[model samples]
Target: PSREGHVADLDRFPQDLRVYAMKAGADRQLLPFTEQAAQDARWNRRFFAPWRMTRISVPVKDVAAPFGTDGRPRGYAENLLPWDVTRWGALASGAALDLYPSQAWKGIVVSNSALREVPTLRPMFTAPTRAGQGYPFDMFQRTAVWMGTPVFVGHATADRAWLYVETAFAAGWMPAADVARVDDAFMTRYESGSLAAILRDDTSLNGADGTHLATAHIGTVLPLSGASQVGRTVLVPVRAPEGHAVVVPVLLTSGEAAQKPVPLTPGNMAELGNRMMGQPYGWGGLYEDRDCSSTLRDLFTPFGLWLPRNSASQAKAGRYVDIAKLDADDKEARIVAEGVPFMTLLWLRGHITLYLGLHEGQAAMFHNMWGIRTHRGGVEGRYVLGRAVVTSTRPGLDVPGNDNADGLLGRMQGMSILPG
Candidate 1:
């Protein structure tokens, strides 16, 4: 009926209208030509054609936003699609560009009618325009901004190879050769910037039709979910997040650099500002290797302390610190409750930042960010880069993204899909 795909329209619009007929196999059906005027989509009266399925119906407008009705409990994006074709990464939030919230903002906001919302990353959609075709092969869903939650990053359709490669980079699993290949993939396409409107493949176009061809159509080696072959949601990211704030502190004067690395303050945090200034901005995720968490993990590996590699884990791991008692001042809770050391950990909107300094001015703080930039493919936004720079922490905090939302939902709903 709607993009929402409600059940009320089921009898009116089944994938195969004939399956429910009195004879159990009749093919009578209706198309949008009579309802809400139909515009030309790639597939028209396509499902109801010969028999198996003939139409992509329109019962009503999507009454409820997608992934809203029963998520977490339903494992929303966890098991969305064929195993080898799932994009892997936590849904991110507050993605922005420059100082504007998001030229094309995408985040989660829930309500009764619509439950979960997600925004489109601008880069993915724009990349096609920049490159002739064949970038991130098979990736679809240019951008979506409905219901308003799940601003996401790092999606690799469940192919183990794809996920492995993406995870390796996101999880600090990169080798020189692999990195080169990834760069080359994009660079080659960069020369021609046009998107392919449709996929024309033997398996993709050839109907599965109760045959083994269906098995060959999608892969099964990558991680998958609940309904197995029958029930898997499909997703595509609009763009990749770019660094919002590139904090490159010239911690040490030229003289300071030449001498021993200066221990800037009472806290034992190192002044790594100089190195952080120009790091290519990347969204922090387990799939995208250069994300904030990955950056932090690399910064900590040298030290003996092992931190969990995720924002939520980092928030709970360290010695419990409390924010200012007054709720008004709680904005810096992660840091204030962060206690003793100046460079503690700061977690916000699913992102992890090293707290280098805090409460410096009216509303500013310091940090060593990955040179804040905009989202790739120009998807409208990035986060508000902080100026504070209190920077030290223990290591081992690389958990995945599902934990944050899953945890929040668990606390609020009493049941959730955190483990998934």
Candidate 2:
């Protein structure tokens, strides 16, 4: 409850981080799942239908104009990028800003691609040869955007190649070939669908002619085209060389969940969550895989929950609980008392995890983790977990070289419990 007076509503949310977090804290109401909701055949059909479509083709990674789009060494383009850069040229230079034009280009992604901080292409497949900013750390993949996603274009290079696009989760420069522009009608039709979500990883999406579209992963939602004895029809938007959206019909097999939102169920939650296990963690969604919050958000989408893109914003999605002042034992006690399994989010400063209830009296969580934090020479570092995992809240308890204070148990600042 808010101290000022009225509570916040989850249905209506703000884009800002603080306001949303406050509202989510006030709006949360956790509910338990029933066995009956998990067993309905319709629910089963809904679950698997989208999975069948996305499992067909995998997106091409390492998309770079190593040779520029016209078959010239892409480095030449970067060399021509006009470098009399100011100290903060990337942010301050009007010319630098001009380098990224603001345009209304719309296109569909042709492959799973990386979003870089800068428009310049670096040697992605090889060693980091440059020394300045955004080299290695910047090289870490931000979000692996799915193929067939619609994007709004922001700006581009003078070379007429590459584009800066805004995908659902992250935005950066993508190859012009990665997206196909569609006419207004195609865009309108693509956007106007009864949605079906992908639940499995590496699933196929077949075209109308039964050819393979891009392989997809969990949380890839598409406009439903209809259903038949074989599977559901999905619309795959392709970018014609002429830059209009060419929509294609694709068949998606009816999968595990029903055609409708799978009523939240414990049995169903585990079944869905287990698929994400061992999936490599992508920092900000690299490798076409999930980061911690993304995994949680996609897993809960089947239950019709919407989580924000990052941890802080996500912490604001449900009922807010402040554990900032609590000790480790008390924090654990509070989570055990209030955290709803699969419906609660554990938040720290930079990372987030989904509470999976207590295991053997210890509060546990499932997260797409990249590492256990450590310190060397007073500088922070990490030992990679690199996969979605289930563990006690006190991860790194037995790990060597980890800072005692960096343990997740002590680091928990808050949690949000959604209406279960």
Query: lDDT: which candidate is best?
Result: 2
Tens-digit lDDT track of model 1 for 185-290: 3223322222111101012211123212111110001111111222321111112233121111111112111111112222212323323332343333211223
Model 1 lDDT, residue 380, Cα: 32
**What's each prediction's TM-score?**
0.29, 0.71
- Show the lowest summed lDDT stretch of 10 residues, model 2: 5-14
- Candidate 2, residue 69: the lDDT equals 42
Separately for all candidates shown, the number of backbone clashes (residues 3 or more apart, or on different chains) is: 92, 43
Show the lowest summed lDDT stretch of 10 residues, model 1: 215-224
lDDT of each: 0.24, 0.60
RMSD of model 2 against the true structure = 12.7
